[PDB]
Write a protein that binds this DNA or RNA. Structure first.
Ligand SMILES: Nc1ncnc2c1ncn2[C@@H]1O[C@H](COP(=O)(O)CP(=O)(O)OP(=O)(O)O)[C@@H](O)[C@H]1O
Lengths: 212, 985, 201
DNA sequence: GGTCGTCTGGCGTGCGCGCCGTTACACCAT
RNA sequence: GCGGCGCGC
DNA sequence: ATGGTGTAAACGCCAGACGACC
C-alpha cells in the first residue's frame, strides 16, 4: 500500500527511480501576509531559511500586474534545486465566507507553477509538486481530532538543544547557527507559523518518500 | 517625542509607587543613569515620582541623592519636588532653619506657597504634613477659607433650588439598623467579584458514573491548583532576576495581587473557556482588564478608605431612614456635600503595550502549568491551533476532547455572575460629579461610549459645574427607587419552564422538542429531487435548532437572578448616553425589558389607594389588554366592570379553568394586575388597601409632538393631541384616509394601478412608514416596507406589487406634506446647516436647554468628518435631547410633592394615587419648556461657535445667510396644552 | 487611459505597434486572431475542447493545456486579454471567477518572457464595456452575438481579408454557425477596437 | 501646490441590550 | 467585530 | 459508535477624482 500512500500524499505522479536520486529540495509555505522557504540536501544540512513579510496584496482588489511584479521579485532569491515542494490545504469552494483566501491561494499557486517550472516546453517533465498538510501532521503526531496543532516545541528541540540520541534528525551549519538562533528568538513574540512548517515539511518529504 | 520605552519605564515607576518594592525601582533608576544613551530617555517625572515615593516613608538621605542627580542633570526642579521635600522635612521634624531655607529657595524661583497647595494634587496626609512644616516655619500662614456651595440660577431650574417654598420629601420604610447591615452585605459581595447562582434547570438523578467523574474533577483541580502556584512562584522568581542588570520586567505588576487571587482567577478563566477555542489576544486583553479591576477594588482595603466610607454612609443613612430625622431637609447631594465628603482620586490606566504583555505572560503560563492524565505519561490540556476566523488567519487555543467529555458528563448546577451585572443590595451613592457615581468600589462612566470616545467627557469636564446639577439630581432620584420580586408569577413561570414551555407566552422550549425530519431507508442519491430536498430539510432543521438553543440560553440567565433575589430588597442605578436618554446599568434583570421581566418587578414601598386609585388600576388593566385604544377613559372604565368575573376567574386559578389573560397583548402584566384588583375588591375598605404596582402613562408620537410645538402648527397639533379634545386623535388613520381620498379621485381619471388597490389600504401598511419619519426615511426604505406588507397580504396580485408600491410611497409622501409643512421646513433647514458645517470640516455641536453639551461621534477613517451621517443624524438627535429634558424636568418637579417617579423614556410610571399630580406637573413643564425660544438661541449659538473668525470670510458669508433664515411660527397658542386630556394619557 | 486599459502604458510606445494578437477565452474553448498595422488579418484559428473545468482544480493540467496552446501562437509585440465583468459579492458565479483568474495568471506569467530581464509589460487588459459602447453592438452591459457585423465586414469594409487566405476564412465561417461560438467574433472586434482607440487617436 | 469644473460609483431610518457559532454530510468497517 | 437570531423606545 | 472514508465546479442624488490650468 506504499504506492497508494504516495498517491494520497503527492498529487503529481512522478516515477520512483527519479525520486530515489534526488539531490536537493526547496519547501515553500505561504499565507495571507508571509512566505518562507528552506533548503536541504541528501545528508540533511540546512544552508538557507528566510521570510518575506511586507507586500501590498490582498486589501480589496486582485490585479495580476501586481502579483506578477511581486512574485517575480520573490523568486529571484530562490536558488536552484531538483524539486520544489508546495503545501496544499484542505480549504474548498464550499466555504463561502473563506473564498477570497481561496482566490489568493489559487492565484499564487498558479503563478508559482508557471514561473518555477522552467524547461517544461523542451522536456515536459515536472519539477513542482504539492504535499498534503494533515498527512505531514500525522507523521509527527500533531493531530488532536481533525485539527493540526503547532510544532514550535519540536523545532525548539531541534535547535537551541543538542541531544544526539545516536540518530539526530537534522543538521545545521556551524557558522550560520547564530543567525538562526537570533531569528528564532526574534520571532517568539509574534508567532509566525509558516517558518516552522516549511522545515517540518522538508524533513517529512525526505523521510516518507526519498529514503523509503 | 513620544517613545514606547519611556512610557514603559514611567508605568514601571508608577506601579512600584503603588506597590511596596521601592528599592527595586531605585536600582533600575541608578543603573539607567550612568549610560550616555540611557540617560537621554530619563524624564523629570520619573525623578519626581521616585522622590515622592522615598518621601512618603521619611527617608531623608534618598531625597538628597535624587536632588543631587537632578542637579547633575539639566532638568528644572518642579514644584512637586518642593512639596515632596517639605513633606519629608515635616514628618522628620527637622529644624526650622532648613525648611525656611527651602521656602526661600522656592521663592527665589518665583513659586508661590499657595501654588503647591493648589496647582498639584496631593494626598490629605501629605498636605497636612506640609501645612505642619510651614506652620512650624511661619505660624501666620493660613489656608484660604471655603465658600458656601453655588446654586443654579437658570430660568427653567429656578424654582427647584428656592428655599422659601414648602417641601415634602419622601422617606423610606426600612428602619436604620436594618439598613446598616445591607451595607455590610453589599460590601462583602463587592469585595469578592464573582457571585455564584444556583441554576433553575431540573435536577438530574446522580448515578455512580457522575460521582466518579466529579471525584476525578476534584482531584484534577487540586493538582492543577498546586501546579499553578508552583509555576507562578518560579515565573516570579526569574522575571525579578531580569529587573537586576537594568532590564524592564512585569515583576512590579505581578506582585500587585497575592498568589491566591491570581490562581483562582486563572482557574475561573479555564472554566469559562468554550469547547471550540477562542482567540489568544482576547484572552490576553480580558486577563489584563480583570487584574487591573481587581487591583483597583483591593487597594481600598489597605488604604483605609472603606472605614471612612462606612462612617460617612452610616451618617448619611439618617436622611433616608424612617425612624431618624434631620434638622433641615434637603436634597441627597446637598446633604452628602454638607457633611465632610470622602475625597476620590481618579486613576489612569496603563499603556496598551504594558497591558498586552501581561495577558501573554499569564496566558502562556496556564498552558505550560496544566497537565492531565491520558485516561502512564501526562498529556497537556491546552493546545495552540492555527485556524481561520472572520475571513482572517488567527491563532486559537484549543482544549482536549477528554476534558470536554468529562465536563459534559458531570452536570454542574451552578452559574457565575459578575458583581456589576447584579442589582445592588443597598441604596446607591448619590451622583455628585462625572467621576463619582453609584457603585461603592467600582468606577462608572456618566455617558456610554462604544469605543475610544474621549470628546464627550472633555466637553462634560470643561462646562461650569453648576450646569449639570439637574441631570445629576435626576439620576440620583432615579437611583433611589426600591424594588422587590413578585413570587406567584415566578412560581408559574418556573413551572412552565421546567416542563416543555409554552412559546406563545414567551417561555422558550427545550432542545428535545425540536422537530425531526422523517428518515428513509432508501438512499437519497438515487433520485435528484430526493437528495435535493433532503439537504434543504436537514439544513433547515439544524438552523431552527441553533436558533432555539440561544433563546433558552438567554431565558436561563434571566430567570436565575429572579430566584436568587427572592425575599430581598434591591436597587437599580442609572446612566446616560451622549444624547441624554437614561438607561439602567444591570443588563440581565431590570425594567425597560420584555413582558416577563416587567411582570416580576414591583414597588417595595406601598401607598394607600385613596378615593381614586381603583379606577386608575382598572384603566391601566384595560390599557394593558389593548382591546380599546380609540375610546375615552369613561368607556374604558365602563368596560372594566363588565368583565370582572373573568378577572376573578383568572386571578383565582390561572392555569386551570378559563384562560382569559392569555388573549391579551401583555398576558403576564395583565395577570399581575388582575391579582391585585381581585385582592382590592374583596377587602372591606378598598380605600385603605395598600398597593405596590406601577401605573403607566405614555403619549403617542412624541417626536411629531415636539416638531409641532417648535413650529406652532395649528393643523399639525390637532392630530398629535396637543389641542384639547374629547376623543383621542390617531395620525395613522388620518394618513390612511388622505391616501384613500387621493386614490379615489385619481382612479376615475386614467388609472389602472389605483383600481386594483381598492380596499387594501389600512393602518398596517403605512404605520411603519409614519413611525420612521423622525429618523430619516428615504423613498427606498419606504417602498421596501410597503412591499413587505403587500407580500404578506394574500389576496393582492403579486405581479403588480412594484408599480403599486411606488404609487403608495408617492402618495403617502404627498399626503405627509399637506398636514406637516413646518416640520419639513425645519428638517430641511437643519439638514442644510449640518451639510455646510460638515463641508467646512467640523462636527455638529449644540447645547441642551438644561445645559448638557452634546457632540456627534461620526467620523471617517485627526480624522475627516463624514458628511452624510452627520447630516442624517442631526434632526433625530435634537428631538431626543428635548424629549429627555421634559423628562428630567418632570422628575425633579414631581420629587418636591412627595412622589415615586420612574420612567422608561416617553412613558411615565407611578402609584395609583399620584396620576393626577403627575399629569398636571407634566403638562405645566411642557408648556414652560416650549414657551422659551429654542430655534433662535440655537441659531445664535451656531453663529457664535461656527463662523466666528477673521479668516475665509467668503465661506463665512453663505453660512451667515443660511443660519439666520429661521422659519416663522404659526398662530397656535401654547397655553391650551394644560387643559389637554390625552397628551400623555 | 484608465477606463480603456488597466495597466498604465506610455503613449509613445503604444501607437508605434506593428502587429497585435487578441485572446478571448471561455469555459469550453479559446480563440485568437493576428492583425498587423494595416487592417489585414494574418491568422484566425479556434481550439477544440479541453480536459479542464471538470471537477477538481489542478495546476499541472492547466500548465500542460496552456503550454500546448501557446506553442501554436505566432510571435507579436503586444498581447491583449479581455477584462470581463464579475462581482465577488455574487455567490453563484464563484467557479467561473476562479477559472478566469487562474487562466489570467497563467497567461500573464507565461507570455511575458522578457519581464524577468527588461521589466516591461507585453500583456494588456481591455474592458468589454468600452468595446460594446464604441462598436455599438449592444448598448450597455448586454452583448449582441455580433454575427451580423462580421457578415457585414466579410461575406467599404473596415477590415481587409488578404488574397490566397480568403477561402480558408470563408470555409471556417460557413461552418460552426449552428454551434454557439463567440470568441472568434469578439477577438477580431477587440483587435479592431484597439487599433481604432489606442492607435490613430 | 491649489484649484477647478466635470463625470462617476456607492447608498439608501436613530439609540441601547442579550445568546450562539466558524469546511458539512452520507456511508462503511471494525 | 464576521455571520444567523431575539428584545425596548 | 466510532473511526475512518469517501464526496463536494426595476430609481435619484451627491461627494469626490482629477487633468489640467493655474
Ligand atoms: N418610538 C418608537 N420608535 C420606533 N419604534 C417604536 C417606537 N415605539 C414602539 N416601537 C415599535 O413598535 C412596535 C410596537 O407596536 P405598537 O405597540 O403598535 C407601537 P404604538 O405606537 O404604541 O402603536 P399603538 O398605540 O397602536 O399600539 C414594536 O416593534 C416597537 O419596537
Amino acid at each position: 500500500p506504499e504506492n497508494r500512500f504516495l498517491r494520497k500524499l503527492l498529487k503529481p505522479d512522478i516515477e520512483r527511480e527519479r525520486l530515489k536520486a534526488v539531490n536537493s529540495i526547496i519547501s515553500i509555505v505561504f499565507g495571507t501576509r508571509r512566505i518562507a522557504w528552506a533548503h536541504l540536501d541528501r545528508k540533511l544540512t540546512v544552508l538557507d531559511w528566510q521570510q518575506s513579510d511586507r507586500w501590498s496584496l490582498m486589501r480589496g482588489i486582485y490585479s495580476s500586474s501586481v502579483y506578477l511584479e511581486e512574485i517575480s521579485s520573490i523568486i529571484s532569491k530562490m536558488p536552484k534545486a531538483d524539486f520544489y515542494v508546495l503545501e496544499k490545504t484542505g480549504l474548498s469552494i464550499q466555504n463561502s465566507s473563506l473564498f477570497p483566501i481561496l482566490l489568493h491561494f489559487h492565484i499564487m499557486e498558479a503563478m508559482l507553477y508557471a514561473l518555477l517550472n522552467k524547461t517544461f516546453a523542451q522536456d515536459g517533465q515536472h519539477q513542482v509538486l504539492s504535499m498534503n498538510r494533515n498527512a505531514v501532521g500525522k507523521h509527527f503526531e500533531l493531530m488532536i481530532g481533525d485539527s493540526r496543532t503547532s510544532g514550535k516545541e519540536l523545532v525548539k528541540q531541534f535547535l537551541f538543544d543538542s541531544i544526539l540520541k545516536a540518530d539526530p534528525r537534522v543538521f545545521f551549519p556551524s557558522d550560520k547557527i547564530v543567525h538562526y538562533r537570533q531569528m528564532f528568538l526574534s520571532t517568539e513574540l509574534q508567532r509566525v507559523e509558516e517558518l516552522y512548517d516549511s522545515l517540518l515539511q522538508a524533513i517529512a518529504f525526505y523521510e516518507l518518500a526519498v529514503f523509503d | 517625542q513620544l517613545s514606547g520605552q519611556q512610557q514603559r519605564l514611567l508605568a514601571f515607576f508608577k506601579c512600584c509607587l503603588l506597590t511596596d518594592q521601592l528599592p527595586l525601582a531605585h536600582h533600575l533608576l541608578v543603573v539607567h543613569h550612568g549610560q550616555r544613551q540611557k540617560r537621554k530617555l530619563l524624564t523629570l517625572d520619573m525623578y519626581n515620582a521616585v522622590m515622592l515615593g522615598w518621601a512618603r516613608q521619611g527617608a531623608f538621605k534618598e531625597l538628597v541623592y535624587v536632588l543631587f542627580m537632578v542637579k547633575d542633570a539639566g532638568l528644572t526642579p518642579d514644584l512637586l519636588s518642593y512639596a515632596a521635600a517639605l513633606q519629608c522635612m515635616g514628618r522628620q521634624d527637622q529644624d526650622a532653619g532648613t525648611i525656611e531655607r527651602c521656602l526661600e529657595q522656592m521663592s527665589q524661583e518665583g513659586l508661590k506657597l499657595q501654588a503647591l497647595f493648589t496647582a498639584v494634587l496631593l494626598s490629605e496626609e501629605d498636605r497636612a504634613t506640609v501645612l505642619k512644616a510651614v506652620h512650624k516655619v511661619k505660624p501666620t500662614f493660613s489656608l484660604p477659607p471655603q465658600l458656601p456651595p453655588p446654586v443654579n440660577t437658570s430660568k427653567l431650574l429656578r424654582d427647584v433650588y428656592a428655599k422659601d417654598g414648602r417641601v415634602s420629601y419622601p422617606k423610606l420604610h426600612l428602619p436604620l439598623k436594618t439598613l446598616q447591615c445591607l451595607f455590610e452585605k453589599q460590601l462583602h459581595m463587592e469585595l469578592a467579584s464573582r457571585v455564584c447562582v444556583v441554576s433553575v434547570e431540573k435536577p438530574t438523578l446522580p448515578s455512580k458514573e457522575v460521582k466518579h467523574a466529579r471525584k476525578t474533577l476534584k482531584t484534577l483541580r487540586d493538582q492543577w491548583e498546586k501546579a499553578l502556584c508552583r509555576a507562578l512562584r518560579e515565573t516570579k522568581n526569574r522575571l525579578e532576576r531580569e529587573v537586576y542588570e537594568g532590564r524592564f520586567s512585569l515583576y512590579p505588576f505581578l506582585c500587585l495581587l497575592d498568589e491566591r487571587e491570581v490562581v483562582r482567577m486563572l482557574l475561573q478563566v479555564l472554566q469559562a473557556l468554550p469547547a471550540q477555542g477562542e482567540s489568544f489576544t482576547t484572552l490576553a486583553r480580558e486577563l489584563s482588564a480583570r487584574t487591573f479591576s481587581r487591583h483597583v477594588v483591593q487597594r481600598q482595603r489597605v488604604s483605609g478608605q472603606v472605614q471612612a466610607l462606612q462612617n460617612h454612609y452610616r451618617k448619611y443613612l439618617c436622611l433616608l431612614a424612617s425612624d431618624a430625622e434631620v434638622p433641615e431637609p434637603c436634597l441627597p447631594r446637598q446633604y452628602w456635600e454638607a457633611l465632610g465628603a470622602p475625597e476620590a482620586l481618579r486613576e489612569q490606566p496603563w499603556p496598551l503595550p504594558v497591558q498586552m504583555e501581561l495577558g501573554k505572560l499569564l496566558a502562556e503560563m496556564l498552558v505550560q502549568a496544566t497537565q492531565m492524565p491520558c485516561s502512564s505519561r501526562l498529556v497537556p490540556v491546552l493546545y495552540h491551533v492555527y485556524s481561520f476566523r472572520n475571513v482572517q488567519q488567527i491563532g486559537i487555543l484549543k482544549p482536549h476532547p477528554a476534558y470536554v467529555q468529562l465536563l459534559e458528563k458531570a452536570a454542574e448546577p451552578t452559574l457565575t455572575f459578575e458583581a456589576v451585572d447584579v442589582p445592588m443590595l443597598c441604596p446607591p451613592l448619590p451622583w455628585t460629579s462625572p467621576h463619582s457615581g453609584a457603585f461603592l468600589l467600582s468606577p462608572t462612566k456618566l455617558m456610554r461610549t462604544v469605543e475610544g470616545a474621549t470628546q464627550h467627557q472633555e466637553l462634560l469636564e470643561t462646562c461650569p459645574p453648576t450646569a449639570l446639577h439637574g441631570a445629576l439630581d435626576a439620576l440620583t432620584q432615579l437611583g433611589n427607587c426600591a424594588w422587590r420580586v413578585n413570587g406567584r408569577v415566578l412560581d408559574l413561570v418556573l413551572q412552565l419552564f421546567q416542563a416543555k414551555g409554552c412559546p406563545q407566552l414567551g417561555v422558550p422550549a427545550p432542545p428535545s422538542e425540536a422537530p425531526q425530519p422523517p428518515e428513509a431507508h432508501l438512499p437519497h442519491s438515487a433520485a435528484p429531487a430526493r437528495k435535493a430536498e433532503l439537504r434543504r430539510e436537514l439544513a433547515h432543521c439544524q438552523k431552527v435548532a441553533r436558533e432555539m438553543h440561544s433563546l433558552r440560553a438567554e431565558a436561563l440567565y434571566r430567570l436565575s437572578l429572579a430566584q436568587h433575589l427572592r425575599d430581598r430588597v434591591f436597587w437599580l442605578p442609572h446612566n446616560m448616553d451622549f444624547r441624554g436618554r437614561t438607561y439602567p446599568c444591570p443588563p440581565h434583570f431590570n425594567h425597560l425589558g420584555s413582558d416577563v421581566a416587567r411582570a416580576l418587578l414591583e414597588f417595595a414601598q406601598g401607598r394607600p389607594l385613596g378615593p381614586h386609585g381603583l379606577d386608575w388600576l382598572k384603566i391601566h388593566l384595560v390599557n394593558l389588554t389593548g382591546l380599546k385604544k380609540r375610546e375615552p377613559l369613561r368607556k374604558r372604565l365602563a368596560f372594566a366592570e363588565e368583565v370582572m368575573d373573568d378577572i376573578l376567574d383568572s386571578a383565582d386559578q390561572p392555569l386551570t379553568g378559563r384562560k382569559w389573560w392569555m388573549g391579551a397583548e401583555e398576558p403576564w402584566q395583565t395577570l399581575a394586575c388582575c391579582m391585585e384588583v381581585a385582592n382590592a375588591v374583596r377587602a372591606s375598605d378598598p380605600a385603605a388597601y395598600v398597593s405596590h404596582l406601577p401605573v403607566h402613562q405614555d403619549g403617542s408620537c412624541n417626536g411629531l409632538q415636539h416638531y409641532a410645538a417648535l413650529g406652532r402648527d395649528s393643523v399639525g397639533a390637532a392630530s398629535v393631541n396637543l389641542e384639547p379634545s374629547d376623543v383621542p386623535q390617531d395620525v395613522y388613520s388620518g394618513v390612511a384616509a388622505q391616501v384613500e381620498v387621493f386614490r379615489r379621485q385619481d382612479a376615475q381619471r386614467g388609472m389602472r394601478v389605483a383600481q386594483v388597490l381598492e380596499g387594501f389600504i389600512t393602518r398596517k401598511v403605512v404605520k411603519q412608514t409614519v413611525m420612521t419619519v423622525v429618523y430619516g426615511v428615504t423613498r427606498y426604505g419606504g417602498r421596501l416596507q410597503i412591499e413587505k406588507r403587500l407580500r404578506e397580504l394574500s389576496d393582492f396580485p403579486q405581479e403588480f406589487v412594484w408599480e403599486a408600491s411606488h404609487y403608495l410611497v408617492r402618495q403617502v409622501f404627498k399626503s405627509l406634506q399637506e398636514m406637516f409643512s413646518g416640520t419639513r421646513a425645519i428638517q430641511h433647514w437643519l439638514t442644510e446647516s449640518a451639510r455646510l458645517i460638515s463641508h467646512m470640516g467640523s462636527v455638529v455641536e449644540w447645547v441642551t436647554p438644561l445645559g448638557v453639551p452634546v457632540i456627534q461621534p461620526y467620523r471617517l477613517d485627526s480624522r475627516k468628518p463624514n458628511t452624510r451621517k452627520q447630516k442624517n443624524g442631526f434632526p433625530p438627535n435634537f428631538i431626543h435631547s428635548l424629549d429627555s429634558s421634559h423628562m428630567m424636568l418632570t422628575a425633579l418637579h414631581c420629587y418636591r410633592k412627595g412622589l415615586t417617579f420612574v420612567s422608561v423614556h416617553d412613558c411615565y410610571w407611578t402609584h395609583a394615587a399620584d396620576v393626577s399630580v403627575m399629569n398636571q406637573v407634566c403638562r405645566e413643564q411642557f408648556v414652560r419648556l416650549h414657551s422659551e425660544p429654542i430655534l433662535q438661541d440655537l441659531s445664535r449659538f451656531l453663529v457664535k461657535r461656527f463662523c466666528s473668525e477673521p479668516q475665509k470670510i467668503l465661506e463665512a458669508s453663505q453660512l451667515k445667510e443660511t443660519l439666520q433664515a429661521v422659519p416663522k411660527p404659526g398662530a397656535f397658542d401654547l397655553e391650551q396644552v394644560k387643559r389637554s386630556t390625552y397628551f400623555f394619557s
